[PDB]
Write a protein that binds this ligand. Structure first.
Ligand SMILES: [Zn+2]
Ligand SMILES: [Zn+2]
Ligand SMILES: [Zn+2]
Ligand SMILES: [Zn+2]
Ligand SMILES: [Zn+2]
Length: 313
């Protein structure tokens, strides 16, 4: 047993984990690595609204529970994902009269947070609330509740579970720019108004060869605001097919990302959006792209894995 990524990360006060999904659990080879290589697990889909509250007022934590129990059995911490999001939302939510949505969102949050109280280290309370230019995404929540929905979601979560870290999660906020500035301002605003928020999750869905050079400065400025930071859905996709040069560039990128987190004391950990290309969500969403993870489809460790372990030391 050589030091696993999880072990290397823990030695430096951080976690290194992977997201997973119920359909993958039957794959014995996949689960054996998932349970021994990582120190943290993120529930990839079954904690989302379409699954936990398929019909109004009727909750279902069955699927999510399976993954949480599995993580506990391996002594792995767990991150909840995600409470409020414009995607993967059951159809009844749109039919809720505008004036009732705030109460519905608060209730959804209260039941889910309460059910898992004491079992999760973090909760991605609100996910992808901003557009690339920094303006608010015009989701059903933004449109019918207004700008305060985000703050209300965090207050509802904190009221249901006092100890769990509350995170705001979004993509394309790794580098300093319009989007991250908007998140930065919101966080600063929350701190001043006493709105509860403990961290910022940078999804980090990156492109090989295009890692934001201002990544670490960006992580640092958030840490200086008084919040923790985590890379929550890390993957670095490339245009297929793979080549030694592309794999090498990807390795360099993974190393740079890991190093960046290690230099900022409040960067608590890294989670890859699953760990093997075999189950990566990338191909299905980004036509012609893939090979974004440290393990390939046959579970062989890529140069990326070597770079990650070296960075973790
Ligand atoms: Zn069910
Ligand atoms: Zn259980
Ligand atoms: Zn209720
Ligand atoms: Zn700026
Ligand atoms: Zn291979």
């Amino acid at each position: 047993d050589t030091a696993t990524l999880g072990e290397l990360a823990e030695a430096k006060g951080r976690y290194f984990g992977s997201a997973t999904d119920n359909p993958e659990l039957p794959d014995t080879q996949y689960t054996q690595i998932l349970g021994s290589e990582f120190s943290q697990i993120t529930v990839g889909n079954t904690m989302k609204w379409q699954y936990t509250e398929p019909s109004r007022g009727r909750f279902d934590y069955t699927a999510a529970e399976e993954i949480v129990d599995l993580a506990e059995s391996n002594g792995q911490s767990v991150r909840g994902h995600t409470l409020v999001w414009h995607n993967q939302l059951p159809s009844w939510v749109d039919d809720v009269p505008a004036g009732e949505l705030l109460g519905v969102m608060r209730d959804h949050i209260t039941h889910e947070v309460d059910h898992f109280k004491g079992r999760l280290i973090h909760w991605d309370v609100v996910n992808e609330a901003f557009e690339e230019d920094g303006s608010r995404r015009q989701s059903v929540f933004q449109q019918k509740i207004g700008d305060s929905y985000i703050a209300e979601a965090f207050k509802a979560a904190r009221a249901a579970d006092p100890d769990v870290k509350l995170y705001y999660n979004d993509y394309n906020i790794e580098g300093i720019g319009p989007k991250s500035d908007a998140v930065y301002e919101m966080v600063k605003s929350f701190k001043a108004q006493g709105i509860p928020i403990d961290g910022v999750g940078m999804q980090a869905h990156l492109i090989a060869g295009q890692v934001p050079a201002s990544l670490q400065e960006n992580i640092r400025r958030f840490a200086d605001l008084g919040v923790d930071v985590a890379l929550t859905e890390l993957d670095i996709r490339m245009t297929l097919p793979r080549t030694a040069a592309k794999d090498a560039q990807q390795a360099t990128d993974y190393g740079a990302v890991v190093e960046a987190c290690l230099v900022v004391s409040r960067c608590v950990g890294i989670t890859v959006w699953d760990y093997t290309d075999k189950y990566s969500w990338v191909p299905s969403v980004f036509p012609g792209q893939g090979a974004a993870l440290p393990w390939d489809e046959d579970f062989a460790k890529k140069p990326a894995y070597h770079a990650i372990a070296a960075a973790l030391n």
